[PDB]
C-alpha cells in the first residue's frame, strides 16, 4: 500500500495537524515511522524534518515530532540514523536558546541511549563533538543533568570522557550547586545500572510529559 503516492499527502497534514494529547501524537508518529520503514529511497526522514530546522518553533517539533519517533522506534538504516543526530546535535553546536537547548539535549540522550548498537562505530567521532558544548558551557543547567546522567549510567560515551571529566573539567554559584553531586557519583563506587533501555523509557516519558506542560 505503501508506494500509493496519495497516502504521503494524508502524513503531511496530518504531521502540520500535530503543530494533540498523547494518543493522537503516538499514532501519527507511529504512522510516520511506518511510512518511513516501508519507502526508504523515494521517502527518506530528511524530508519531512528539513522544513521545520529554522528557529521559529523547531522546540516544540523535537519535543513532539523526533522524541515520539525515536522512543516508539527504539529496520532504520545507518545513513538516515547519520543525518538525523548530525541534524539534532547541530542546534548545540551551530556551524540557542535555553529552551530549545534543552529539547535538543534530551534528543541527543534519547539518540545515544537507543542506537547504542549501530551508533558506537563512531564513539570517538562523538567523543570529539562533546567536548566543545563543556569547554564553552552551552546551556544554564541542562548540562550538568546531561553529565551527571553519563556518570550515573556511564555508557561506552563515559569510557572516552573519562579524562576530559576530572583533569580539565575540575581544575560560586549555582552551577556548582549540584558540582558536588557529579563528583560524588563520578568516584568508583557501587555501580547499579539499568536492567534494560524499557526502564529508562518511563522516565524519558515522564520528563517529556513535565517539559510538555513546561511549554
Known amino acids: 500500500i505503501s508506494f500509493l503516492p496519495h497516502l504521503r499527502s494524508l502524513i503531511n497534514v496530518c504531521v502540520n495537524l500535530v503543530?494533540?494529547?498523547l494518543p493522537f501524537s503516538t499514532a501519527v508518529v507511529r504512522l510516520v515511522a511506518l511510512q518511513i520503514q516501508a519507502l526508504?529511497?523515494?521517502?527518506?526522514?530528511?524530508?519531512?524534518?528539513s522544513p521545520f530546522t529554522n528557529q521559529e518553533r523547531r522546540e516544540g517539533m523535537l519535543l513532539n515530532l523526533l522524541i515520539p519517533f525515536v522512543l516508539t522506534v527504539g529496520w532504520l538504516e545507518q545513513p538516515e540514523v547519520q543525518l538525523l543526530l548530525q541534524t539534532v546535535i547541530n542546534v548545540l553546536?551551530?556551524?540557542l536558546a535555553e529552551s530549545t537547548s534543552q529539547a535538543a539535549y534530551l534528543?541527543?540522550?534519547?539518540?545515544?541511549?537507543?542506537?547504542?548498537?549501530?551508533?558506537?562505530?563512531?564513539?570517538y567521532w562523538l567523543s570529539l563533538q562533546v567536548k566543545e558544548m563543556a569547554?564553552?558551557?552551552?546551556?544554564?543547567?541542562?548540562?550538568?543533568?546531561?553529565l551527571d546522567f553519563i556518570v550515573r549510567?556511564?555508557?561506552?560515551?563515559?569510557?572516552?570522557?573519562?579524562p576530559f571529566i576530572q583533569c580539565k573539567l575540575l581544575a560560586n554559584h549555582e552551577e556548582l550547586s549540584a558540582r558536588?553531586?557529579?563528583?560524588?557519583?563520578?568516584?568508583?563506587?557501587?555501580?547499579?545500572?539499568?536492567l534494560c533501555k524499557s526502564s529508562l523509557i518511563a522516565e524519558?516519558?515522564?520528563?517529556?510529559?513535565?517539559?510538555?506542560?513546561?511549554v
Open 153 to 162: 549510567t556511564r555508557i561506552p560515551i563515559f569510557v572516552l570522557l573519562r
Open 180 to 194: 558536588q553531586h557529579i563528583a560524588d557519583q563520578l568516584e568508583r563506587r557501587f555501580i547499579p545500572r539499568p
Open 40 to 49: 526508504k529511497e523515494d521517502f527518506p526522514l530528511s524530508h519531512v524534518i
Open 204 to 214: 524519558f516519558n515522564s520528563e517529556l510529559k513535565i517539559l510538555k506542560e513546561a
Open 107 to 123: 534528543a541527543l540522550k534519547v539518540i545515544l541511549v537507543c542506537f547504542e548498537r549501530q551508533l558506537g562505530s563512531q564513539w
Open 135 to 146: 569547554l564553552r558551557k552551552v546551556g544554564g543547567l541542562a548540562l550538568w543533568d546531561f
Open 19 to 21: 503543530m494533540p494529547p
Open 93 to 95: 553546536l551551530p556551524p
